[PDB]
Design a protein around this nucleic acid. Structure first.
Lengths: 116, 136, 177, 78, 66, 149, 188, 50
RNA sequence: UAGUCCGGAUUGGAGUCUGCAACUCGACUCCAUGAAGUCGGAAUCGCUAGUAAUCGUGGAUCAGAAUGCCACGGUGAAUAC
RNA sequence: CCGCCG
RNA sequence: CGACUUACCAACCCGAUGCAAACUGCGAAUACCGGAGAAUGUUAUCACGGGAGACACACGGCGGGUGCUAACGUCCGUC
RNA sequence: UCCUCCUAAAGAGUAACGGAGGAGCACGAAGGUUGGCUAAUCCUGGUCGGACAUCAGGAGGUUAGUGCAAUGGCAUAAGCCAGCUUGACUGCGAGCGUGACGGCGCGAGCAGGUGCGAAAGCAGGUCAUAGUGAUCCGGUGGUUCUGAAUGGAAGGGCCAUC
RNA sequence: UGCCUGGCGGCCGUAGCGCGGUGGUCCCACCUGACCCCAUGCCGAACUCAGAAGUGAAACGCCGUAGCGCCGAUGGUAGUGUGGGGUCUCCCCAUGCGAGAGUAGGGAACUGCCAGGCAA
RNA sequence: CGGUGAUUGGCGCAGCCUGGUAGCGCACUUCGUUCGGGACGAAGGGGUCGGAGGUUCGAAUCCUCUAUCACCGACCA
C-alpha cells in the first residue's frame, strides 16, 4: 500500500502534536495540487485553508504541482493566517519527507511571517 | 488407564467439586449413562466400567466415553510426616458433577444397552442413572 | 532498449486480442528481473563471495547487493546475519537491455540446449529459470573464473495467471520447450 | 525429602491509587503498573515505570479511545 | 543510479556468423564475436532431427535388401 | 572483508592475506610491522608461526595490534609508533628522532614514554623502576638522563 | 572470592590451600549416625602432580584457583621457553622448563597441545595422544639371524629414543604416542 | 565482575571526574566522552583513567 | 611434463570371419567413449653371460578362438670384495 | 640379543 | 533405473464434546477508594505528649493451601 | 538476600519444608535523537541446493521479536535499520507512591551548559520489573572550612570516590 | 440547498471481510521522464523532482448482497451479599443483586469543520 | 528410605568441566611371516554417547524427569 503506510508514518507526530494542544499546519502533497490548511487545537474545526485547487491561486501559475506552486500555497496560507490572529503554529509533515514541495510551503510560510 | 499426554504442570491444587454438570444431553450416541451423584472417577474406574460394558454388548456397537481424567492426585507415602513438600502423583481422577453423561452407546437394542450400563455402573463409585437421546 | 520500443506497440497490441482486455492498463507488463547468485560456500572464503559478486557485476550491469541470512540454521552452519548470497534487482531501463541480452545471445550459448520450461511459473505469472554456468554470458573472460556455479533469473511481472505471463514471454519468443 | 520452591518477592504494591473523580494535586501518582495497561491521556504524564502521574490539580476520569479500547486516563480540570 | 560504484556500461557491437550485426549495451569492453544468436540456432531445425530416430523393423528390412 | 581495501586509504603498501605468507616463506625484509584482524587471526597464528615472533611481529589482546577498527588504526601507526619491546636483561632501548627537529619537544617525547611505561607494569617490579638512562645519538653522543626529572 | 565447603564439591573443582593448587579427582561424602560429616577426598597435586589424599571434615575447605585449561597451539621455541596461541582469542602465553617437564620431546610444531594455566601463567603442558616425528640416528637394522621380533631402538628428531621395527631407517617419518612413548605406525 | 570500573578525568584545569564502567577485554580503546564539568560550567572532553 | 598427442579399461554404434548356429559364450576391424593408473606397504622372486633385460617372429592344439606353453633370432648390460 | 609347540 | 496391490497410523482445517491455580475473544455479587446528602452516635476521628502490656493463641462459619475433600491436624484470609 | 507467576478469596497486603521458574549481569551502543521500515511459519516457482541458506511471488496475520526468567506491555511500535551523536549532564525539585525505621520508587517544572531535529519537540541511560549490602576503619583526588602560643604543616571535616 | 470528491477529525467492528456491480470533465490513483534537488546497504521499486500522453486495470470511493465476523433482548439457569436451616466433602429457604452461553432479532455504520467540482 | 555419581565400540576406560570433533588399549577383518598355529609386521573396519523433555542457531557435553547398576548413610530414646 502507498497511502496507509504514510498514515502510520505520520501518526507519531500527530498524536504527540495534539497532546500539546497545537494549532497545526497540515500539508497534503499529491502529484498535482499541493494542499495546506490550519486546524484548531480541538482537531475538529479548521481556520485557514489555501491550496492550488482554488481558482484564485491556479490562474497565476503555469503548473500546479511543483516547488514554486508550493511556495504560492505557503504564502497564501500565511497571508490568511495573520488575519485571524494566528501567529504561532506547528508544522505537520503529514508523513511527507520534509524535502521538496513541502519544504517550500514551510519556506514561504516562514518567509511571509507565519511564526514557527 | 486413561491418562493425559504431556501435561503443563505435574501437580495441581485440590479444588472443590461444586456446581452442576455440562455433559447433560446425549450427543454422540443413542443411550447414555448419566451421573446423579457428586463424586470423582479414577482412571482405573473408567477403564474397569468400560471392560464390564464392552463385554456385555459383544464388541460390535459403538461406545463413547465422555469423561477424561486430566487431574492428578498426589499421595503421601506411609510412615512419612507432614510437610516436606506435596506428595507424588499416583493416579488421575475426573471430577463428576450431578448430570454428567459418563458413557454413551449406539448400535445395540434398547434392552441390551439397558442391561450393560447396569453392569458398568456397579464398577463406579457414583450413583448413575439411565438416559436416552432426546429430541432437542 | 531495443525490445522495449518493440514492446510499446507490437506486444501490447498483441495481448489485447489474446485475452480481450477492455483497458490498456490490464495488459501484462514486466516489472523487474532479479538475479540471485546463491553462493552458499561463502562459509569457507569471504573472497569466494567476492569473485561471485564480481560475476554479477558483469552479467548484470550494476553492483550487486550481498544478502544476509534471515534465520540461522545449523544444517548448513550459518549464523544470523552472515552473508550467504548476492542479488541484482535490475529493473527499468537496464532490465530491457538485459532481457534483450538474455534471450538473444545468452540462451543460445547454453551448452546442450533444448528449451526453457513451460512450467517454471509460480501460479502468478512470474518466471524463474536457473543457469548452471557463468560462461553463457560473454561478459565472463572464461579465464578469471575458478568455479562452475551459475545463478537463477527470476522475472517478476504484473500478470495474474500462469498463462497470462506465459503469453507475455512468448511474444519475445523466449523459446519454451 | 526436599523442596525446590519457596521463593517469591516483595509484593510491589501496584494498581490504581486515585480513582475516578477524585481531585489530585499535580504530580500525584494515579496508577502504578507494570506495562502500559492504562495509557496516559489528557494532562496526565507517564513515567519510566508506566506510573501515570497527574499534571494538573483536577479530577481523573478513565476512558476508552481510538480503535483499541485502552482504558485511558485523563484529568478534568477543576 | 549511484556514481562511482557501478561498472562501466559502454555500448558494444555484436556480430555472429550469420551476418547478424546487432548493437547492444553491455559491459564486455571493446567488441564481441558470436557463434549463434536467437536467429539461426538449432531450436527449430533441432527437433526436426529428434522425432524420426526410433524404429527397428525399418532397421531390419535394410538387412533384408528387398 | 572491506578491510582488504579500506586500510588502502590508510597508506599501507601490501594490504591483504596469505599473499604475504608466500613472502614469509621467502624471508623478505620489506616490512617491520604485522597488523591483523580477527578475520586474519587464523593466518599468522597458523602459517607464519615461528617467523612472526622469532623476529617478533604478531598481535593479540595485549599490544594494540589486532582490533577490527584497522582504518583509523593505521592513520597514525604508519606515522609515529616505536615499539617498546622486551629484553632478557634490564634494557628497553627506544629511538629518538632525526637531529634537526625541534629538540625541546623531544624532551617531552622522551617524557611521554615515562607515563606510559609507568602506566602499567607486571605488578612484580623489583627495587627500582629506572636505574640508568643515556640518550645516545647513533654511535658518539652520551647524555646521562635522570629518571626523576 | 570463591570459598568452598567440603560437602559441596564433586570432581574437577580446583582448590587452593597450603600455597599449591589442587584438582579434586573424586570425593566420597560420608556421615554416620552419632558422628559428624567428613569427605575422604582423593585430590591431585597440580604443579608437581603425583596424588594426595586428604580427608576433610564437613568444614572447612579451600579457595579456588584461576586455573583455566584451554586449548593452546604450540608454535615456537627459544632458549628455554615455549610460546602458545589460542585459536579462539589469540592471546600470548609463555611456558617454562619446569612447566614443560618430561614433555619437551613430544611437541614438534603447530600442535594443539593443551596446557593448564594457573593464576595467569602455565604450569603443565600436555602433548597430544599422537605426534608424527622423524628418525635421524638409527642403525640400518639388518636381520642377520634374529628369529623372534627384532625391535631396534631409534633416536628421533626431537631427541627422543623409541623402539621401532627393522624397516624404518632415516627419514622414514614415523608417528608415536606420547602417553607411553611407543611406536604405533609409520606416516607416509 | 569482568566489566571493571574506570574514571573519566576532565581535560579542564580542575580535577572533577566521572566514574563509570567499561569492559576492557572486549573493547580496549579509551573513552573520549564529552561531559559537563561543574567546576568550569562548560562541556569539555573527559578521558578515561583508573 | 600435463592425467597430458601418456594409458588403454569400460561402453554405445556399425561390421567382417569361421561354423548348422556367435543370446548365454568367439576372434577381428571401424567410429565414438576415455576409467583406474604418476613406479607400488609389510613382505617377496628371477638371473653371473650373448645371461638378466628388452624387441619382434614361428609352431603345436585347432573350423574359429591365446597375454599361456613350446621353440627362434635382434640389441645387449651391471656386479661378484 | 632374539627362537614358544604339534 | 523404477514402483504395483495396498486388512492399518494419522498433522492442518471442518462439525460435535468436555477440562484448567499458574487458560480468557466474556464476567457477577460483595469488598474497596472518592464525592454529595439526611438522620443517628457522650469526638465515636486525627495529631501530639506520659505510661503500658503484648508479639505461645483456641474453636466455630465462610473462601482456600496442605493431608486421606483424615484428625480437637497444619498454614494464611475474613467474621 | 533479590526478581516473576500462582495459592491470594476481581483495591493493596497475605502464610506453609505450598506448586513453578530466574538473578549476584550485560551494553559507549544494546544509550540519545531524527528519518524510514514490519514480523513467525507454511505454499508454489527457481543453478549447484536437501527437511531447511539465498531469490521471487502468494497465503497468513504478530502464532514473531523484545541482551537474559516470568508476568504486564509494545504498530504512534518499546520490535528491525540507517545518519548524527554523549541528556549514561551538574545544581535543585512542587507533588505524591511505598516501607516500623534505615531506606526505596515516580516526578512536571527551575537554573547552567549541550545533543539531535527545518521545526513543534524529545533527551538527567536502556520496554518495565532482579543484576545487590548499613556502619566503623582506612585508601586516592579536590576544596585553606578548622588547623591546641603564633606562621605553616600534620591530622580531622566537606565534596568526588575506593 | 442537493449530489460527487479531497484533507482533518468525532466515534470505534450494527462501522470488519467476502462476493457481485460501478465511477474519471473535477478530484484521486496508477501513469510519463529523471541530466539535475534528493534518493537506493544493488535497483528512482520506494523516496524525491519535473510534467500530463494514457487508463479506471490495480488501488480507492460509492452501490448492492448476510455468505462469515460483530451487535443483541425478554425468560430461564449458574453464581452470590445478608439472615435462618438440613439426610452438612454439598445444598435449601426468605430477601437483594443477577450473569455467561444460547434464542428471537437487528445489522452492509453514522457524523462535524473546510475546500474543490457539478447541478440548482 | 534418601544422597550421590556414573551408566561412551564385542569388553574396559578417556572425552564433558569451558556447546561446534566421538578417541585409546585389547579383540575382530584382510594381507605378510611360518611346514602350520602362537607371537610379530602392514593395511583396515565398527559406536554415534542409558531413555525422555527443554535450553540454544546448534547438545555426548548444560537442564529436568526417569531407568537399574554401584557407593554411603537408616540417629537419640
Amino acid at each position: 500500500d502507498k497511502k496507509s503506510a504514510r498514515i502510520r508514518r505520520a501518526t507519531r507526530a500527530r498524536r504527540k502534536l495534539q497532546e500539546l494542544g497545537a494549532t497545526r499546519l497540515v500539508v497534503h502533497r499529491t502529484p498535482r495540487h499541493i494542499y495546506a490548511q490550519v486546524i484548531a487545537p480541538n482537531g475538529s474545526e479548521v481556520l485557514v485553508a489555501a491550496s492550488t485547487v482554488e481558482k484564485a491561486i491556479a490562474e497565476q501559475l503555469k503548473y500546479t504541482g511543483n516547488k514554486d506552486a508550493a511556495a504560492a500555497v505557503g504564502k497564501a496560507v500565511a497571508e490568511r493566517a495573520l488575519e485571524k490572529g494566528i501567529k504561532d503554529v506547528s508544522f505537520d509533515r503529514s508523513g511527507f519527507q520534509y524535502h521538496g514541495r513541502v519544504q517550500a510551503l514551510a519556506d514561504a510560510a516562514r518567509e511571509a511571517g507565519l511564526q514557527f | 488407564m486413561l491418562q493425559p499426554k504431556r501435561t503443563k504442570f505435574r501437580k495441581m491444587h485440590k479444588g472443590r467439586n461444586r456446581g452442576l454438570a455440562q455433559g447433560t444431553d446425549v450427543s454422540f450416541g443413542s443411550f447414555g449413562l448419566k451421573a446423579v451423584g457428586r463424586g470423582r472417577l479414577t482412571a482405573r474406574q473408567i477403564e474397569a466400567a468400560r471392560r464390564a460394558m464392552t463385554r456385555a454388548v459383544k464388541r460390535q456397537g459403538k461406545i463413547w466415553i465422555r469423561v477424561f481424567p486430566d487431574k492428578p492426585i498426589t499421595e503421601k507415602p506411609l510412615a512419612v510426616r507432614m510437610g516436606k513438600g506435596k506428595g507424588n502423583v499416583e493416579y488421575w481422577v475426573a471430577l463428576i458433577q450431578p448430570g454428567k453423561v459418563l458413557y454413551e452407546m449406539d448400535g445395540v437394542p434398547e434392552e441390551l444397552a439397558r442391561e450393560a450400563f447396569k453392569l458398568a455402573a456397579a464398577k463406579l463409585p457414583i450413583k448413575t442413572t439411565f438416559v436416552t437421546k432426546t429430541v432437542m | 532498449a531495443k525490445l522495449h520500443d518493440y514492446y510499446k506497440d507490437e506486444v501490447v497490441k498483441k495481448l489485447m486480442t489474446e485475452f480481450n482486455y477492455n483497458s490498456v492498463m490490464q495488459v501484462p507488463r514486466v516489472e523487474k528481473i532479479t538475479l540471485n547468485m546463491g553462493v552458499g560456500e561463502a562459509i569457507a572464503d569471504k573472497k569466494l563471495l567476492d569473485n561471485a559478486a564480481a560475476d554479477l557485476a558483469a552479467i548484470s550491469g550494476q553492483k550487486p547487493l550481498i544478502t544476509k541470512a534471515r534465520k540461522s540454521v545449523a544444517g548448513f552452519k550459518i549464523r544470523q546475519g552472515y552473508p550467504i548470497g548476492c542479488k541484482v534487482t535490475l529493473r527499468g531501463e537496464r532490465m530491457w537491455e538485459f532481457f534483450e541480452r538474455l534471450i538473444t545471445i545468452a540462451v543460445p550459448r547454453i551448452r546442450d540446449f533444448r528449451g526453457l520450461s513451460a512450467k517454471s511459473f509460480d501460479g502468478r505469472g512470474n518466471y524463474s529459470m536457473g543457469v548452471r554456468e557463468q560462461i553463457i554470458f560473454p561478459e565472463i573472460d572464461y579465464d578469471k573464473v575458478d568455479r562452475v556455479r551459475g545463478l537463477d533469473i527470476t522475472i517478476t511481472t504484473t500478470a495474474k495467471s500462469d498463462e497470462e505471463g506465459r503469453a507475455l514471454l512468448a511474444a519475445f519468443d523466449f523459446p519454451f520447450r | 525429602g526436599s523442596t525446590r520452591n519457596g521463593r517469591d518477592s516483595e509484593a510491589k504494591r501496584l494498581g490504581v491509587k486515585r480513582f475516578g473523580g477524585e481531585s489530585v494535586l499535580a504530580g500525584s501518582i494515579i496508577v502504578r503498573q507494570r506495562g502500559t495497561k492504562f495509557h496516559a491521556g489528557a494532562n496526565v504524564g507517564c513515567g519510566r515505570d508506566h506510573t501515570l502521574f497527574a499534571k494538573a490539580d483536577g479530577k481523573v476520569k478513565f476512558e476508552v479511545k481510538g480503535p483499541k479500547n485502552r482504558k485511558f486516563i485523563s484529568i478534568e480540570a477543576e | 543510479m549511484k556514481k562511482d560504484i557501478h561498472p562501466k556500461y559502454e555500448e558494444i557491437t555484436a556480430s555472429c556468423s550469420c551476418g547478424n550485426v546487432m548493437k547492444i549495451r553491455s559491459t564486455v569492453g571493446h567488441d564481441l564475436n558470436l557463434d549463434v544468436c536467437s536467429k539461426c540456432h538449432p531450436f527449430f531445425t533441432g527437433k526436426q532431427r529428434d522425432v524420426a530416430t526410433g524404429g527397428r523393423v525399418d532397421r531390419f528390412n535394410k538387412r533384408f535388401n528387398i | 572483508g572491506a578491510n582488504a581495501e579500506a586500510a588502502k586509504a590508510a597508506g599501507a603498501e601490501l594490504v591483504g592475506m596469505e599473499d604475504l605468507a608466500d613472502q614469509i616463506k621467502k624471508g623478505e625484509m620489506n616490512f617491520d610491522v604485522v597488523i591483523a584482524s580477527p578475520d586474519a587471526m587464523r593466518v599468522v597464528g597458523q602459517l607464519g608461526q615461528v617467523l612472526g615472533p622469532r623476529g617478533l611481529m604478531p598481535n593479540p589482546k595485549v599490544g594494540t595490534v589486532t582490533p577490527n577498527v584497522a582504518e583509523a588504526v593505521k592513520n597514525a601507526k604508519a606515522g609515529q609508533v616505536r615499539y617498546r619491546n622486551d629484553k632478557n636483561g634490564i634494557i628497553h632501548t627506544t629511538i629518538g628522532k632525526v637531529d634537526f627537529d625541534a629538540d625541546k619537544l623531544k624532551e617531552n617525547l622522551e617524557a611521554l614514554l615515562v607515563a606510559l611505561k609507568k602506566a602499567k607494569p607486571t605488578q612484580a617490579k623489583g627495587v627500582y623502576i629506572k636505574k640508568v638512562s643515556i640518550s645516545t645519538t647513533m654511535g658518539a653522543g652520551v647524555a646521562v638522563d635522570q629518571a626523576g626529572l | 572470592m570463591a570459598t568452598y565447603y567440603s560437602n559441596d564439591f564433586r570432581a574437577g573443582l580446583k582448590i587452593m590451600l597450603d600455597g599449591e593448587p589442587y584438582a579434586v579427582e573424586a570425593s566420597e561424602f560420608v556421615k554416620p549416625g552419632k558422628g559428624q560429616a567428613f569427605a575422604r577426598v582423593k585430590l591431585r597435586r597440580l604443579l608437581t602432580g603425583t596424588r594426595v589424599e586428604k580427608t576433610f571434615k564437613s568444614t572447612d575447605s579451600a579457595e579456588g584457583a584461576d586455573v583455566v585449561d584451554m586449548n593452546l597451539t604450540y608454535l615456537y621455541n627459544d632458549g628455554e621457553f615455549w610460546h602458545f596461541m589460542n585459536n579462539e582469542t589469540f592471546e600470548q602465553l609463555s611456558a617454562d622448563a619446569k612447566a614443560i617437564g618430561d614433555n619437551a620431546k613430544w611437541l614438534l610444531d603447530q600442535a594443539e597441545c593443551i596446557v593448564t594455566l594457573w593464576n595467569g601463567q602455565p604450569i603443565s603442558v600436555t602433548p597430544p595422544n599422537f605426534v608424527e616425528l622423524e628418525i635421524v640416528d638409527t642403525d640400518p637394522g639388518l636381520k642377520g639371524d634374529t628369529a623372534g621380533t627384532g625391535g631396534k631402538p631409534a633416536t628421533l628428531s626431537t631427541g627422543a629414543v623409541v623402539k621401532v621395527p627393522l624397516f624404518v631407517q632415516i627419514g622414514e617419518v614415523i608417528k608415536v604416542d606420547t602417553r607411553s612413548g611407543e611406536y604405533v605406525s609409520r606416516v607416509k | 565482575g569482568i566489566r571493571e570500573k574506570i574514571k573519566l578525568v576532565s581535560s579542564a584545569g580542575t580535577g572533577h571526574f566521572y566514574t563509570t564502567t567499561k569492559n576492557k577485554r572486549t573493547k580496549p580503546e579509551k573513552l573520549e566522552l564529552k561531559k559537563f564539568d561543574p567546576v568550569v560550567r562548560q562541556h569539555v572532553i573527559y578521558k578515561e583513567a583508573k
